[PDB]
Ligand binder design. Structure first.
Ligand SMILES: [Mg+2]
Lengths: 50, 50, 50, 100, 50, 50, 333, 50
């Protein structure tokens, strides 16, 4: 847990129905190693007749 | 009558009489066309770049 | 629908417009018949009555 | 509200197709979403299966007689197409009487 | 009916071959959760502490 | 605050060309997918990184 | 489904466990082999064409090895329970129309921004018992959902009577109040449905929804009438359609990657996954490191899938073999 | 209103973050009470490890 939290995280908020998102990758200003990566997608198509 | 290559899938096909679209589609001479002007962007109000 | 309601209509059109349309783009023109225009009038009337 | 094709009647007055609301353009698509499709150079064909006389064209003598009987026929054909890219840009709420 | 249809445009093709157009959609995603385990691999029930 | 990103790629992707069996698409900031003519895979990873 | 590879994966199907490299007769047959020194491990798999062997696993460069019971891989179908808010009114008020909104978040696209709304409504009457309300509303919801004007099955509708309290009564667009004869209905159940799956073109995906309610004027104030309570799921989609696509993918790491892009000029690939069968999964991670200056690691994954009866029998024997053959200690699931 | 990042949904429709009432710039400060901090030359460091 980042953000200074000390009491933890309730059991709820960690259940089947819970959805997440990417914020950022924070790193040191001293001796910083690598973090992160990127992501891709792809489309679809449709049809017709006469 | 047989396979020469190791991964050869096609064989020699032959027919005699009245020819149909089924004939031409079964010997890979029929293809759906691609309408390139036609295009569909799925409609949504993108709350990104906000 | 068995009974046309303007309540259901305004909900659907708003929810749709929210997720897909800008506030400057939520004009909806309905093509219908004279008897539908009367059904529409009747319901708008029952509405302001509230 | 054409009473010819629309044959089902609403009890509260008239043709049940008038009690029908349709938003055909939910937004502006910048591209036609509904259009009539047509084929180039292979549209309607026309021919005559006649014998000795053709009232259609007005021909009196036939060198190539299809049949002996004194009759003329006319055949026409056409190919059609119509596309709706995304029906999600179309809203329509319909009376149930017109369903099944 | 002629007017209804003549209100729409028309587009030419070259044949009676089935045509297909591409459909590109949306990108931004949001990942659900399956479960959560403590530091010892035991799963956290909803009637559990932080 | 400090932020870092990384991304790995294989050399085979150099001057690599894509067989456009389905349109190759970028992801935009808005959240909409946009068709692209490019055939190089490096074009797309470059975009996703920034 | 395309997935994330640390840098590579490989999948071999454990359709049968053989004690020797000689007993490999039928496809799927697999045997784990490792020296007595327990210095290197590999699997010999009976391929359909012939006989193959996995990469060699240095038992000191193994990072994690763990099984999976196919129950953590069955996506559970979330079902709501709709009821009348007893704090607004335990019964339907006559002249109010009870509309119900079903919001769908991923309809055709991938985003939450691509959302879609169906509805369901009933105008109440005098002496309309709550059971009658759930009935009429269930038909309204089912008819607008399961009609012949929906490109996908969005939702499934069920009812429950106080007598059973566990049996879910189906309600489709083909059901009528003449069939729903009970008088003790307590709620309206609303599941999500499993969408169409194609092996390597359409992956396993769902449409998640939320029953949102509209207000009714009870005395003089606008108030929601319902309670969209989430209850424990009872229906899951098994692992089949998920493992098969993983297999479809992990067989381009050691095979044909085109898989159709030249239709008649294709190399047909035979697969050993039967969608409809449920597979436990064993997954081993490990790396290869060079000699002197090539200390950069090369992490590698090797996946194994065995069908799952209720007892996890096929994967518990496979694990016992690998443990006795490699000295590892993998937990029998 | 962004539905991707905002996950909790309100009983009355939409994301619970749309129901958030915020007054920025109370009163009038001679200088900006909120600004983005950058550094003079360039804190953008790119490198390839290939
Ligand atoms: Mg439509």
């Amino acid at each position: 847990l980042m953000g200074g939290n000390t009491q933890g995280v309730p059991a709820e908020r960690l259940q089947q129905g819970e959805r997440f998102s990417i914020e950022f990758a924070p790193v040191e200003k001293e001796l910083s190693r690598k973090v992160g990566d990127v992501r891709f997608t792809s489309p679809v198509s449709m049809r017709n007749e006469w | 009558a047989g396979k020469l290559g190791k991964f050869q899938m096609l064989g020699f096909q032959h027919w005699k009489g009245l020819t149909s679209d089924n004939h031409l589609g079964a010997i890979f001479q029929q293809a759906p066309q691609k309408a390139t002007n036609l295009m569909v962007q799925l409609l949504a109000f993108y709350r990104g770049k906000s | 629908y068995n009974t046309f309601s303007l309540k259901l209509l305004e909900d659907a059109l708003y929810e749709l417009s929210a997720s897909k349309l800008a506030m400057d783009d939520r004009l909806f023109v309905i093509k219908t018949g004279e008897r539908g225009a009367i059904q529409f009038h009747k319901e708008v009337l029952k509405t302001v009555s509230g | 509200d054409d009473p010819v094709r629309n044959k089902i009647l609403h009890p509260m007055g008239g043709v049940a197709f008038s009690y029908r609301y349709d938003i055909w353009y939910i937004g502006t698509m910048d591209q036609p979403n509904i259009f009539k499709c047509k084929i180039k150079g292979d549209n309607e064909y026309r021919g005559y299966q006649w014998g000795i006389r053709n009232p259609f064209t007005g021909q009196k003598g036939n060198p190539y007689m299809s049949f002996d009987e004194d009759s003329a026929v006319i055949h026409r054909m056409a190919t059609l197409g119509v596309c709706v890219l995304d029906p999600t840009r179309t809203m329509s709420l319909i009376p149930a009487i017109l369903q099944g | 009916l002629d007017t209804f249809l003549n209100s729409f445009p028309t587009r030419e093709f070259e044949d009676d071959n089935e045509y297909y157009w591409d459909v590109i959609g949306s990108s931004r995603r949001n990942i659900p959760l399956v479960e959560a385990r403590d530091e010892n691999g035991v799963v956290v029930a909803a009637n559990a502490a932080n | 605050t400090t932020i870092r990103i990384q991304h790995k790629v294989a050399g085979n992707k150099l001057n690599k060309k894509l067989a456009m069996g389905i349109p190759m698409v970028r992801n935009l900031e808005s959240g909409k997918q946009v068709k692209d003519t490019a055939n190089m895979w490096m074009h797309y990873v470059d975009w996703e990184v920034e | 489904m395309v997935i994330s590879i640390n840098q590579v994966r490989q999948l071999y199907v454990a359709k049968a466990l053989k004690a020797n490299t000689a007993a490999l007769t039928t496809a799927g047959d697999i045997v784990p082999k490792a020296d007595t020194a327990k210095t290197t491990l590999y699997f010999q798999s009976m391929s359909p064409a012939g006989i193959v062997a996995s990469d060699k696993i240095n038992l000191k460069h193994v990072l994690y090895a763990k099984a999976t019971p196919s129950e953590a891989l069955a996506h559970k179908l979330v079902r709501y329970s709709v009821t009348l808010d007893a704090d607004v009114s335990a019964t339907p008020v006559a002249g109010q129309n009870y509309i119900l909104r079903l919001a769908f978040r991923q309809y055709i696209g991938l985003s939450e921004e691509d959302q879609y709304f169906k509805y369901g409504e009933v105008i109440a009457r005098s002496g309309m018992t709550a059971s009658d309300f759930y009935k009429k509303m269930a038909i309204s919801l089912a008819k607008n959902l399961e009609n012949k004007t929906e490109s996908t099955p969005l939702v499934n509708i069920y009812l429950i009577s106080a007598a059973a309290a566990s049996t879910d009564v189906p309600v489709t667009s083909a059901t009528k109040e003449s069939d729903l004869t009970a008088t003790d209905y307590n709620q309206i159940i609303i599941e999500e449905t499993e969408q169409p799956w194609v092996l390597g073109m359409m992956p396993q995906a769902f449409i998640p929804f939320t029953p949102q309610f509209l207000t009714i004027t009870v005395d003089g104030e606008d108030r929601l009438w319902g309670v969209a309570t989430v209850v424990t799921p009872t229906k899951t989609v098994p692992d089949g359609h998920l493992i098969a696509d993983l297999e479809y993918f992990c067989m381009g790491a050691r095979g044909d990657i085109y898989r159709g892009m030249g239709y008649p000029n294709i190399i047909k690939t035979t697969y050993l996954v039967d969608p409809g069968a449920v597979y436990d999964v064993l997954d081993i991670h490990y790396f290869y490191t060079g000699s002197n200056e090539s200390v950069q690691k090369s992490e590698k994954t090797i996946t194994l899938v065995a069908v799952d009866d209720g007892s996890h029998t096929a994967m518990n024997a496979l694990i016992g073999a690998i443990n006795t053959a490699s000295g590892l200690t993998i937990a029998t699931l």
